[PDB]
């Protein structure tokens, strides 16, 4: 245990109505971790868009942001459905350890345009 997840592509470009899909990769046998997908706020805080597994009790949840676990179990698709003008910005994913409770490690940040 354990390294931060990877997050690709570094630069993702779309324009209106498209689907913008990132990939978060986290090699683990969990050993319970959970994953978060964040976008950087205007005040440079990490705003949580979605989790894996799904954070169903998140208030103000936006269903346009979806996180899907791929069959290899290590790769996750983090996707904005029908991406919009203001969705452009900085994105990243994080792995959170449930046992030390606190522990998060973040990926490198990416850009969506």
């Amino acid at each position, epitope marked *: 245990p354990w390294n931060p997840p990877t997050f690709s592509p570094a630069l993702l470009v779309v324009t209106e109505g498209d689907n913008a899909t990132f990939t978060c990769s986290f090699s683990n046998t969990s050993e319970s971790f959970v994953l978060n997908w964040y976008r950087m706020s205007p005040s440079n805080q990490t705003d949580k868009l979605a*989790a894996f597994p799904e954070d169903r009790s998140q208030p103000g949840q936006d269903s346009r942001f979806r996180v899907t676990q791929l069959p290899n179990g290590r790769d996750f698709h983090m996707s904005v459905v029908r991406a919009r003008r203001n969705d452009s910005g900085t994105y990243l994913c994080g792995a959170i350890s449930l046992a030390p409770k606190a522990q998060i490690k973040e990926s490198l940040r990416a850009e969506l345009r």
Partner: antibody, heavy 119, light 112 residues
Framework: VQLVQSGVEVKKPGASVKVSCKAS????????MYWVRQAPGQGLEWMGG????????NFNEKFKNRVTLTTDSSTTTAYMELKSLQFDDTAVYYC?????????????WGQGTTVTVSS | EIVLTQSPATLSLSPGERATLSCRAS??????????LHWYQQKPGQAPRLLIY???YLESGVPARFSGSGSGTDFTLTISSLEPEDFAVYYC?????????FGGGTKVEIKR
């Protein structure tokens, strides 16, 4: 780390009540806030939650028509307004925080606000 | 809604004795090996305190004699040896979906 709630309320039926829950900057950037109540002699009932980062809310459907949830970022205070009060709204009301990353339980509760509703 | 049934309503035990509390859900509260179930303690005139989160994780600050177990519909909270401070009411709570709900509570009282 503190959640400090406003004091005792005594209200007529049909009236409104607004309960406050003062937190911290850390709480507001790292937690969601939830409201829970407890009638005298009874257990706990969830009412709703709010995301201090965008004002988004969720609700127990039972309370949706009469509860308004808001936050004041500048004073890092959460508010619960219950309108059109009924006799069985008499309860202790709690605010509680939950890690914004994942539900790792309500790890800190305010001291509670007693609300009595009666003609 | 998912409804949580706690039993027994009252446990009568002496200090030093093991306490085992049960919580049963009307539908499964587990997904992907995660169980969205937590346990709280409440004393008269006081707000609840978190003991156990996600079925089996000990909240930091909480003594090692408290432990949680279970998955799906069947959960237990165990106190390996009761201290005088542990006589209180205990609740379980789920967040598998909305609405969030709590069990009816189990009171642990002193046997005499």
């Amino acid at each position: 780390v503190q959640l400090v709630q406003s004091g005792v309320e005594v209200k007529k039926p049909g009236a409104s009540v607004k309960v406050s829950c003062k937190a911290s900057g850390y709480t507001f950037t790292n937690y969601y806030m939830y409201w829970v109540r407890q009638a005298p002699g009874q257990g706990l009932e969830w009412m709703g939650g709010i995301n201090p980062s965008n004002g988004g809310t969720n609700f127990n459907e039972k309370f949706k028509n009469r509860v308004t949830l808001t936050t004041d970022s500048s004073t890092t205070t959460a508010y619960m307004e219950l309108k059109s009060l009924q006799f069985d709204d008499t309860a202790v009301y709690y605010c509680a925080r939950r890690d914004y990353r994942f539900d790792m339980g309500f790890d800190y509760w305010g001291q509670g606000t007693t609300v009595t509703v009666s003609s | 809604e998912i409804v949580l049934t706690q039993s027994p309503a009252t446990l009568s035990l002496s200090p030093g004795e093991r306490a085992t509390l049960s919580c049963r859900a009307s539908k499964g509260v587990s997904t992907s090996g995660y169980s969205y179930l937590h346990w709280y303690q409440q004393k008269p005139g006081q707000a609840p305190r978190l003991l156990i989160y996600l079925a089996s994780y000990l909240e930091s600050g909480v003594p090692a004699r408290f432990s949680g177990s279970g998955s799906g519909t069947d959960f237990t909270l165990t106190i390996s040896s009761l201290e005088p401070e542990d006589f209180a009411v205990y609740y379980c709570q789920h967040s598998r979906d909305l609405p969030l709900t709590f069990g009816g509570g189990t009171k642990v009282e002193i046997k005499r």
